[PDB]
Design an enzyme around this catalytic site. Structure first.
Site, PDB file in Angstrom:
ATOM      1  CB  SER A 208     -16.981  -5.138   0.812  1.00 36.58           C
ATOM      2  OG  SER A 208     -17.455  -6.091  -0.310  1.00 36.58           O
TER       3      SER A 208
ATOM      4  CD  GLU B 224     -23.970  -2.544   2.790  1.00 35.85           C
ATOM      5  OE1 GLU B 224     -23.481  -2.855   1.681  1.00 35.85           O
ATOM      6  OE2 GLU B 224     -23.649  -2.197   3.837  1.00 35.85           O
TER       7      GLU B 224
ATOM      8  CG  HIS C 239     -20.803  -1.910  -1.275  1.00 37.99           C
ATOM      9  ND1 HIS C 239     -20.557  -1.189  -2.534  1.00 37.99           N
ATOM     10  CD2 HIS C 239     -20.241  -2.985  -1.623  1.00 37.99           C
ATOM     11  CE1 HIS C 239     -19.851  -1.729  -3.234  1.00 37.99           C
ATOM     12  NE2 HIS C 239     -19.471  -2.957  -2.970  1.00 37.99           N
TER      13      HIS C 239
END
Ligand SMILES: *[C@@H]1O[C@H](CO)[C@@H](O)[C@H](O)[C@H]1NC(C)=O
Length: 536
Positions: free
Chosen positions: A203, A327, A440
């Protein structure tokens, strides 16, 4: 010394360290925790680039994790493990510039490839001491030397009055670079090989990794790179100088405040005052958008990441990139009305249109109309289950999957060796609802090999899966190629090319090769959507 363990005493440039012998499932590892790499960025040092740690006397105790960088603490679901696991697990402090090393026990005679983890957390949160970043499994099972650093997040790391001397921006990124420099100078003392240094992050950590790729002074400090679910390009990872200046002066006003006088006053504010107001400076109601992020400063970043990847030479670069199945689902419960972890979050068409304005906060009326048009299923435009899943896809595609496809495409076309994946396994132990799929950050525990710990209640297939991924990652770190040369055709993982656009699925079944990373949809986001906002 005298009666201590000979394997736990190490000297580095700044002094002597005593580490700890830790138990991994298959044997012991050496761990050196809370090694300082910078002068504590406190007082007059707040907002400033880090100064390298001055040498200490005696043997520094490096047997426990150090402070977590001062940050916002999530409170959306008090007591819930799905959120808590990301929360700070050591004292919050501005004195937080420490790093951690894991190595085999006893430490290797020949130099071992080094993996450096950079954590995510939107550039406002995160810590190298979280349980999911535990390097002992990679160190024990794969014999890797694993390093992770703390870097300043939020305002402390990213507030910028661009151009000024006393708050130049990107200093959180400079904390990371300092630790990379510490690894070059010192890792050999642990059996690590400085000429085989692989960066990996997830990320904002992935975007961080991406920025070291794009920033020349970082380039000489590592050799390969993994970017999990994140990119330096895209809509959240950077702000312009103007926009950082705007947010910084607004935040200053909010706590009670010529650049020098502004920053000098900001330095007199308690750390917690800054955290209390940091969410009040965003231009719109939004999700997947953060107040204080890397700035395009013309220094660390010489141009926008979009520009640098379009026109960059990546001949000698090996890169592994990928995304998780869902995501976009994680942040829907954080500010899109209709969504919750406690129900199925079936939503109306109205909530979907409203969601699109929140999830694409920088879109005009026409651009949002385009998004809604593209993601609506015109056979069932009012179906609540589709709409829920389409809302998630909009957020995920716009923020991660399409920036990643864009990044993979530009790197491959410009010399780089790229391998691509999509992670599709949902942890048997996941506490978020089924509708959120594989959110995620939930590949991480697998890459670090947590399922190898018997007390964690992962299935046997999950334990085997985790080992597969540890092998892929460490083969990549060693060779620039995730495939095992010994075990041939099981099947192979092909590089991603602009011609064939190949990537693999990562799940319990063996590698499956697929083509096109949301090719059609990403054309929308990457090719069309800019031209639309370039004419509204
Ligand atoms: C692991 O196993 C036992 C048995 O189900 C359970 O009591 C314990 O809470 C589990 N631990 C985790 C990590 O959930």
């Amino acid at each position: 010394e005298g009666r201590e363990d000979p394997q736990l005493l190490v000297r580095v440039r700044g002094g002597q360290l005593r580490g700890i012998r830790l138990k991994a499932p298959g044997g012991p590892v050496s761990a050196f925790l809370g090694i300082p790499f910078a002068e504590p960025p406190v007082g007059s040092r707040r907002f400033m680039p880090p100064e390298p740690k001055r040498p200490w006397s005696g043997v520094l105790d490096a047997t426990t994790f150090q402070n977590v960088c001062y940050q916002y603490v999530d409170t959306l679901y008090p007591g819930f493990e799905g959120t808590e696991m990301w929360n700070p697990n050591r004292e919050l402090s501005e004195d937080c510039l420490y790093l951690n090393v894991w190595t085999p026990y006893p430490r290797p005679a020949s130099p071992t490839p080094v993996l450096i983890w950079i954590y995510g957390g939107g550039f406002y949160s995160g810590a190298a001491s979280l349980d999911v970043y535990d390097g002992r499994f990679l160190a024990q099972v794969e014999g890797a030397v694993l390093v992770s650093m703390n870097y300043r997040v939020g305002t402390f790391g990213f507030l910028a009055l661009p151009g000024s001397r006393e708050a130049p921006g990107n200093v959180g990124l400079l904390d990371q670079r300092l630790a990379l420099q510490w690894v070059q100078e010192n890792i050999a003392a642990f059996g690590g090989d400085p000429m085989s240094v692989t960066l990996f992050g997830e990320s904002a950590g992935a975007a961080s990794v991406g920025m070291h790729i794009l920033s020349l002074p970082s380039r000489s400090l590592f050799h390969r790179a993994v970017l999990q679910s994140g990119t330096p390009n895209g809509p959240w990872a950077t702000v312009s100088a103007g926009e950082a200046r705007r947010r910084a002066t607004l935040l200053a006003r909010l706590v009670g405040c010529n650049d020098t006088e502004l920053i000098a006053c900001l330095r007199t504010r308690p750390a917690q005052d800054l955290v209390d107001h940091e969410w009040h400076v965003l231009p719109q109601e939004s999700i997947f958008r953060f107040s204080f992020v890397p700035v395009v400063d013309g220094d660390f970043l010489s141009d926008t990441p979009e520009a640098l990847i379009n026109t960059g030479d990546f001949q000698d670069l090996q890169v592994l990139v990928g995304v998780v199945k869902d995501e976009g689902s994680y942040f829907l419960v954080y500010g899109v009305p209709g969504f919750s972890k406690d129900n199925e979050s079936l939503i109306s068409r109205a909530q979907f249109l409203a969601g699109v304005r929140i999830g694409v906060p920088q879109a005009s009326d026409l651009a949002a109309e385009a998004v809604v048009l593209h993601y609506t299923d015109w056979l069932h435009p009012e179906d609540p289950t589709h709409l829920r899943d389409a809302m998630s896809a909009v957020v995920g595609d716009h923020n991660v999957v399409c920036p990643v496809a864009q990044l993979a495409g530009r790197l491959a076309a410009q010399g780089a060796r790229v391998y691509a994946y999509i992670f599709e396994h949902r942890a048997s132990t996941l506490t978020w609802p089924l509708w959120m799929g594989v959110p995620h950050g939930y590949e991480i525990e697998f890459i670090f090999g947590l399922p190898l710990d018997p007390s964690l209640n992962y299935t046997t297939e999950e334990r085997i899966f985790a080992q597969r991924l540890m092998k892929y990652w460490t083969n990549f770190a060693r060779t620039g190629d995730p495939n095992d040369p010994r075990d041939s055709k099981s099947p192979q993982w092909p590089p991603y090319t602009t011609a064939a656009q190949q990537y693999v699925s990562l799940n319990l079944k063996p590698l499956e090769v697929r083509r096109g990373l949301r090719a059609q949809t990403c054309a929308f986001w990457n090719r069309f959507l800019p031209k639309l906002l370039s004419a509204t």
